[PDB]
Ligand binder design. Structure first.
Ligand SMILES: */C=C/C(=O)Nc1cccc(-c2c(-c3ccc(N4CCN(C)CC4)cc3)[nH]c3ncn(CC)c(=O)c23)c1
Length: 246
């Protein structure tokens, strides 16, 4: 139907990665390794977004079975990355850089006037050299005005980014530990915010709390978050010292 179309025979499905449809690792033509998701709204959104920190759409097959060919991220989702063997070795410099890449991708989304709506570690993908990219275009990750009234905006994504900062600094732990969804909603609406993770510097938790401001228009932009995180160990914590875990 459009210029993202390709012949199905040009794809070779090699390994199954996940289920829900399914996602496969394969080869496009004979030269390019790709991820193949086996619905159109996701592709239509990606067709307009091209950024180094967003999993890139490659091609689409519109005749059933429907395929969505995408960039292959070799290390899986960030959640599983943090929770696996790597987590014990990651320290604050690596986690802040990873968060910086995520904000760079979201800063692009922001400039394009799009909204993600489900930002969290399980929807970031990891590649080689600690490359992180936003993918997959959850009350504990959702801003109150979006969870209660369906007001999803780039500012609800910033709220989500704040929660995702707790995932990074706890290396994959679930937010609001020990609390069920209904208790989080009741407590957050009454003003509760998660405290400073252990070994997390106050300056990073202040950034979290800014993402968690009641008024969505007072939450920082992703442009701001990206610059703050890129500059973090010169402008904000130039005397950082490694701890027991961060
Ligand atoms: C948070 C879990 C998650 O998102 N899993 C997941 C489901 C479906 C597809 C992908 C995926 C992967 C991917 C890469 C590498 C791995 N590994 C399996 C376990 N060994 C130990 C390490 C490597 C699993 C999954 N790569 C992908 N590339 C692109 N996409 C489309 C956006 C993927 O979905 C994807 C992960």
């Amino acid at each position: 139907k459009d210029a993202w179309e390709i012949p199905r025979e040009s794809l070779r499905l090699e390994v199954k990665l996940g289920q829900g449809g399914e996602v496969w690792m394969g080869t496009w033509n004979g030269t390019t390794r790709v991820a193949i998701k086996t619905f159109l709204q996701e592709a239509q959104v990606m067709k307009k977004l091209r950024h180094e920190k967003l999993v890139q759409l490659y091609a689409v097959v519109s005749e059933e079975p429907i395929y969505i060919v995408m960039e292959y991220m070799s290390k899986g989702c960030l959640l599983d990355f943090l929770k696996g063997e790597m987590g014990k070795y990651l320290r604050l410099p690596q986690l802040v850089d990873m968060a910086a890449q995520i904000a760079s991708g979201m800063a692009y989304v922001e400039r394009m006037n799009y909204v993600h709506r489900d930002l969290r570690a399980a929807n970031i993908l990891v590649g080689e050299n600690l490359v992180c990219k936003v993918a997959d275009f959850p009350i504990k990750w959702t801003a109150p005005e979006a969870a209660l009234y369906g007001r999803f905006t780039i500012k609800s994504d910033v709220w989500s980014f704040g929660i995702l900062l707790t995932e990074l600094t706890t290396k994959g732990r679930v937010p609001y530990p020990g609390m069920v969804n209904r208790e989080v909603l009741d407590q957050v609406e009454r003003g509760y915010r998660m405290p400073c993770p252990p070994e997390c510097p106050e300056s990073l938790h202040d950034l979290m709390c800014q993402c968690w401001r009641k008024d969505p228009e007072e939450r920082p932009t992703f442009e701001y978050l990206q610059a703050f995180l890129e500059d973090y160990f010169t402008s904000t914590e130039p005397q950082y010292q490694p701890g027991e875990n961060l």
